[PDB]
């Protein structure tokens, strides 16, 4: 399946047991669809870019 790219649009909050994960919603750039939320690890701010390998799941917490 073709790979899709997306830009970080908004940071929600810290998730995980140790609080290392950061729930951040993303939005595709090429095709306007699937403005789904994902879980990111590390320092994340508004304006980052996440190379989503898939576009199927949300994976909340």
């Amino acid at each position: 399946q073709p790979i899709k790219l997306a830009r970080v649009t908004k940071v929600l909050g810290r998730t995980g047991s140790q609080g290392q994960c950061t729930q951040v919603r993303v939005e595709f750039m090429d095709d306007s669809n699937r403005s789904i939320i994902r879980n990111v690890k590390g320092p994340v701010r508004e304006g980052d870019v996440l190379t989503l390998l898939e576009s199927e799941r949300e994976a909340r917490r």
Partner: protein
């Protein structure tokens, strides 16, 4: 001393009610003293409902729910964190928690 006016049960005008069994311990608990908990949850989790949705051979199929009627004894409804020990004046609040 009498801790509750209703003695922790809903027996008013009766002498004996039918005892039922608990869920996580299987203890004989009276029907009026049981800690009712009507659990209604989806069959598939919200984290996995999307994988089942795309694998559905239909266009729009609402996933049914798990309608489970649970009964808890006092010793287990507190250990399972279903009910808590409230303050002396807070125990009189019969309103269900939001």
């Amino acid at each position: 001393t009498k801790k509750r006016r209703n003695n922790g049960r809903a027996k008013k005008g009766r002498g004996h009610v039918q005892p039922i069994r608990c869920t996580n311990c299987a203890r004989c608990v009276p029907k009026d003293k049981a800690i009712k908990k009507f659990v209604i949850r989806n069959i598939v989790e919200a984290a996995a409902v999307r994988d089942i949705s795309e694998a559905s051979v239909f266009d729009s199929y609402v996933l049914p729910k798990l309608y489970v009627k649970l009964h808890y004894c006092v010793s287990c409804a507190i250990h399972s964190k279903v009910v808590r020990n409230r303050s002396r004046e807070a125990r009189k609040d019969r309103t269900p928690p939001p």
